[PDB]
Amino acid sequence: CGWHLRDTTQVPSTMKVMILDSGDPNGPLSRAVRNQLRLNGVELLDKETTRKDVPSLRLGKVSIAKDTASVFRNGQTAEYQMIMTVNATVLIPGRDIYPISAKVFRSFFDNPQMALAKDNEQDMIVKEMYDRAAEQLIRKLPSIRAADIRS
Amino acid sequence: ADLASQCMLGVPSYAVFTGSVDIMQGNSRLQADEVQLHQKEPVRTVDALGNVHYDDNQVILKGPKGWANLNTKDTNVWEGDYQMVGRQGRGKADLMKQRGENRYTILDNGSFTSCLPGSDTWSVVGSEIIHDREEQVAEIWNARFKVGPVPIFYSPYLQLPVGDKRRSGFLIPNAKYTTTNYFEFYLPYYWNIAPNMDATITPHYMHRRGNIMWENEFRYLSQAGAGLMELDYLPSDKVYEDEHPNDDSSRRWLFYWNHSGVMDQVWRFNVDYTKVSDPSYFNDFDNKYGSSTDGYATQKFSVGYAVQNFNATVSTKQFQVFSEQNTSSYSAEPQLDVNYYQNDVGPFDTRIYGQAVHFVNTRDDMPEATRVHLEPTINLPLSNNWGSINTEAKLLATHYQQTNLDWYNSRNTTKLDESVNRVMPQFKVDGKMVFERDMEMLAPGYTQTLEPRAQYLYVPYRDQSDIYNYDSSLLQSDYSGLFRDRTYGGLDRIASANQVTTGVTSRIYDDAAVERFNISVGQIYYFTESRTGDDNITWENDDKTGSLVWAGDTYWRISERWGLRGGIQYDTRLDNVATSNSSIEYRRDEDRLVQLNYRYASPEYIQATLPKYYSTAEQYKNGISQVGAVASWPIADRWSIVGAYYYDTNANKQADSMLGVQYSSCCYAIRVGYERKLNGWDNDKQHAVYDNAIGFNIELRGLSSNYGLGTQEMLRSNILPYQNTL
Amino acid sequence: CGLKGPLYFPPTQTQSTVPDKNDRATGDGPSQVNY
Numbered sequence: 001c002g003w004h005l006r007d008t009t010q011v012p013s014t015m016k017v018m019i020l021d022s023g024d025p026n027g028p029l030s031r032a033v034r035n036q037l038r039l040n041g042v043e044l045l046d047k048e049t050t051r052k053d054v055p056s057l058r059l060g061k062v063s064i065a066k067d068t069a070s071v072f073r074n075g076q077t078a079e080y081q082m083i084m085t086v087n088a089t090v091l092i093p094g095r096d097i098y099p100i101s102a103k104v105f106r107s108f109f110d111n112p113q114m115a116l117a118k119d120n121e122q123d124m125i126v127k128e129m130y131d132r133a134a135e136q137l138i139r140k141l142p143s144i145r146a147a148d149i150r151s
Numbered sequence: 152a153d154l155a156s157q158c159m160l161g162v163p164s165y166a167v168f169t170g171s172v173d174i175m176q177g178n179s180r181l182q183a184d185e186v187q188l189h190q191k192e193p194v195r196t197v198d199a200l201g202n203v204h205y206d207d208n209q210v211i212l213k214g215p216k217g218w219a220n221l222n223t224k225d226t227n228v229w230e231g232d233y234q235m236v237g238r239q240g241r242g243k244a245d246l247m248k249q250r251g252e253n254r255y256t257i258l259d260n261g262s263f264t265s266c267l268p269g270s271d272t273w274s275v276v277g278s279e280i281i282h283d284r285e286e287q288v289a290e291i292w293n294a295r296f297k298v299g300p301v302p303i304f305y306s307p308y309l310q311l312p313v314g315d316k317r318r319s320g321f322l323i324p325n326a327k328y329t330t331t332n333y334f335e336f337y338l339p340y341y342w343n344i345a346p347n348m349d350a351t352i353t354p355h356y357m358h359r360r361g362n363i364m365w366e367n368e369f370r371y372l373s374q375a376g377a378g379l380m381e382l383d384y385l386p387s388d389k390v391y392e393d394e395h396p397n398d399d400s401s402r403r404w405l406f407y408w409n410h411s412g413v414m415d416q417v418w419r420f421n422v423d424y425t426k427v428s429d430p431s432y433f434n435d436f437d438n439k440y441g442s443s444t445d446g447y448a449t450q451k452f453s454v455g456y457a458v459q460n461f462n463a464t465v466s467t468k469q470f471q472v473f474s475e476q477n478t479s480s481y482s483a484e485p486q487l488d489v490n491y492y493q494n495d496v497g498p499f500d501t502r503i504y505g506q507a508v509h510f511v512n513t514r515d516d517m518p519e520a521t522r523v524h525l526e527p528t529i530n531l532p533l534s535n536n537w538g539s540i541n542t543e544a545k546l547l548a549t550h551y552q553q554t555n556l557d558w559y560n561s562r563n564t565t566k567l568d569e570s571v572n573r574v575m576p577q578f579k580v581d582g583k584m585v586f587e588r589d590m591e592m593l594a595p596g597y598t599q600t601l602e603p604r605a606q607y608l609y610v611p612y613r614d615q616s617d618i619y620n621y622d623s624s625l626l627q628s629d630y631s632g633l634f635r636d637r638t639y640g641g642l643d644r645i646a647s648a649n650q651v652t653t654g655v656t657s658r659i660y661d662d663a664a665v666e667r668f669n670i671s672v673g674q675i676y677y678f679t680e681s682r683t684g685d686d687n688i689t690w691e692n693d694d695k696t697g698s699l700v701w702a703g704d705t706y707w708r709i710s711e712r713w714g715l716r717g718g719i720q721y722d723t724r725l726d727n728v729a730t731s732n733s734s735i736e737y738r739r740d741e742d743r744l745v746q747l748n749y750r751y752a753s754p755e756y757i758q759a760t761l762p763k764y765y766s767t768a769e770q771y772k773n774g775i776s777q778v779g780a781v782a783s784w785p786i787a788d789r790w791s792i793v794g795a796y797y798y799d800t801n802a803n804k805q806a807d808s809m810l811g812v813q814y815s816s817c818c819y820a821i822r823v824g825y826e827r828k829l830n831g832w833d834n835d836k837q838h839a840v841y842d843n844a845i846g847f848n849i850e851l852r853g854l855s856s857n858y859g860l861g862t863q864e865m866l867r868s869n870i871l872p873y874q875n876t877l
Numbered sequence: 878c879g880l881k882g883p884l885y886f887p888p889t890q891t892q893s894t895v896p897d898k899n900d901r902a903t904g905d906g907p908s909q910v911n912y
């Protein structure tokens with residue numbers, strides 16, 4: 001009833017070739033974004049390239065925070081909530097600079113009797129949050145292309 | 152308008168003559184009446200008389216009599232009043248002098264207030280105030296600090312730091328009243344070691360403990376990253392002695408160290424270390440580096456090397472558990488993780504993950520182990536515009552060496568082995584589609600998407616009851632975690648899998664291709680029971696196969712200021728909703744927000760996943776049912792109220808409440824805070840224990856660029872701090 | 878009398894993996910209070 005398979009691509013046709021730029025090129029978010037763009041068939045160029053007509057994706061400040069979300073009746077922590085916030089910009093070669101952002105929420109229960117096990121669980125959670133934040137940024141690329149046509 | 156620019160418009164902005172004089176030399180003016188000019192050898196002198204007005208770009212000087220020297224640039228204004236131009240500050244002295252190429256502004260029996268004209272909230276009268284522009288300091292002799300017309304204290308040499316350059320000296324103290332320590336007073340001294348390091352020493356005096364606690368902070372900035380150390384030491388405690396008379400020494404202390412940095416883009420260094428003298432340290436003493444809500448102290452070091460397609464890490468993980476019901480705690484000393492990635496091996500992507508860890512326990516009766524893991528992986532990704540399918544295969548090969556098993560094997564029916572091998576493959580298939588439709592009955596230009604997803608996972612069954620569980624904990628199943636390929640963390644319990652996950656997400660985009668709404672539902676269907684060989688979870692139902700796990704998520708961005716979030720988990724083996732949470736926020740800016748939230752965790756979920764004494768202990772057994780409210784709003788553009796209230800609907804008692812008020816003028820700021828929190832459990836009367844705290848802070852303004860309203864510091868200062876969910 | 882402020886080297890960011898547990902949001906700026 002009106003539905004049809006997605007005829008257009010995920011990443012805009014303009015951003016088929018991009019420059020991925022970062023201050024921590026070997027970090028966990030750069031690896032997540034670079035792999036996500038590779039799935040979408042995007043050809044990534046080096047920052048120091050001869051090309052002067054390709055958009056540049058810049059990865060900025062990444063914050064991870066773990067806070068107490070609820071407590072037991074003795075005041076001890078019951079649940080921890082983790083928030084990951086990512087800031088980025090997409091520079092079109094000739095137009096302005098378009099900022100984008102991501103925010104991921106996760107939570108889990110705390111167990112002082114298996115604190116080592118809960119440490120490994122938290123490390124696993126952060127890796128997943130990096131995959132989600134990489135997807136959220138890529139879903140914002142069509143919004144940048146639309147703003148480009150308006151201006 | 153904001154405070155910073157509201158306090159700006161208040162401040163100013165850029166041969167006898169015998170007549171109305173307006174002599175100007177580039178920038179400096181002199182609107183005197185009678186000017187007497189001399190050129191005696193040349194030693195050029197200017198003798199002004201009558202309503203002298205030395206206007207400038209830096210100061211405005213007014214005085215009945217003036218004088219100047221055109222060679223050494225020495226001025227003299229008698230019985231005058233000055234005022235800074237382009238900055239905040241004004242006063243009145245019996246003699247104003249500019250000396251040393253207009254470096255020193257020396258005042259004899261002068262005063263100085265950074266308050267706006269017509270306001271005299273505070274002043275500091277001295278006798279030899281000197282403003283030095285190279286050092287950005289204002290030295291005062293025989294200083295008397297005055298509030299209104301009433302002095303409050305006297306002391307020689309009351310330097311006032313002008314500007315934003317850092318200096319070493321005493322900071323303004325602050326006070327508290329808590330029910331644990333009674334009246335408290337902090338007197339900080341700041342030491343400015345170097346541009347990239349500094350230290351701070353704070354004698355914290357607590358009335359009830361009857362001694363001074365010494366707080367020492369050290370911040371540094373290096374090539375390897377930025378860090379912070381904290382070392383607190385209370386030589387003796389009077390409250391602690393009564394509760395623990397048998398202990399010979401009642402010292403309390405805390406060591407904290409946090410480091411994080413990346414050097415040369417390839418070396419990553421991390422430290423997260425906490426150590427305290429006793430379990431009850433944070434229930435008594437309020438720190439920025441620990442909370443009374445903690446259950447243990449984490450002590451981790453990590454050194455790693457990362458490149459484009461390879462990374463290795465060596466780390467140690469140790470924990471200090473506080474509760475007296477726990478005495479055994481495992482540690483990784485050390486752990487080595489290695490990853491290697493290689494793509495485009497034909498149409499496949501390959502990957503290797505290896506590990507080597509050594510487990511040690513605080514107790515001397517517990518098993519001790521060494522484990523080596525290898526995990527090669529290969530996948531074949533396929534995709535197009537409207538769909539993608541990803542097929543993956545994996546091998547999980549582990550080896551164990553378990554020693555010190557005599558004490559455990561004596562009192563348990565099933566025995567641990569000394570040498571264990573565990574090899575098991577894993578096969579997974581993951582699919583995805585996307586549909587779209589033009590949703591015009593909502594608004595023109597909108598679209599809606601429908602994204603169904605499916606996954607199939609198969610792992611065979613290995614009996615893992617001869618392996619002790621060191622680092623495996625049950626993982627939550629939210630909607631994001633429905634498609635996870637693991638049931639436990641770590642590598643000690645690897646459950647079997649023969650299951651299909653199905654889910655669907657719908658999104659609503661507007662004409663700007665900006666997402667407005669998304670909602671998700673999913674389930675996991677089991678064809679065979681998931682067993683690790685050591686299965687002792689306490690399920691309410693004897694269900695093994697079928698559709699057992701359900702989950703959902705939502706997010707609606709109603710406007711630029713409104714937001715709604717939700718999530719629910721249902722488990723059929725619990726016969727009830729496992730967990731749930733909800734949240735709605737309105738947020739105009741940092742100083743205007745309202746938030747409502749709810750958190751739920753069933754009594755059966757506590758029984759299934761947490762320790763066995765949780766389901767019988769009164770402070771644990773009922774799960775979670777918590778309603779919270781957070782607000783922040785200004786009144787009359789200077790006041791700022793922050794409040795928080797968290798309520799437990801199961802016990803009909805609060806968990807936390809907070810209230811803070813701050814008044815921030817153009818030359819001072821005052822903040823008062825209150826918080827009542829849960830702070831322990833009384834085992835005799837079987838009721839919770841609360842703590843009350845009132846804090847009073849004061850501050851001077853107008854000397855540096857600081858004009859904060861203190862909202863974010865107040866919103867983050869309780870046990871359940873504020874998180875921005877918009 | 879002293880002023881406390883941010884550190885700098887004597888004359889974007891790193892993507893971490895360790896979260897900040899219960900950060901108290903004590904801003905780093907020129908101040909005469911401890912924070």
Ligand SMILES: *C[C@@H](COC(=O)CCCCCCCCCCCCCCC)OC(=O)CCCCCCCCCCCCCCC
Nearest residue numbers: 296298303304305306309310311321322323324849878879
């Ligand atoms: C170097 C100073 C840092 O502070 C300054 O910059 C100098 C100005 C001092 C700021 C005082 C603000 C607090 C007092 C305001 C009035 C109370 C509140 C009013 C109602 C809400 O070092 C400091 O840290 C400041 C000095 C320490 C605090 C002073 C408290 C009183 C001292 C009395 C001892 C004097 C005894 C001899 C004279 C009787």
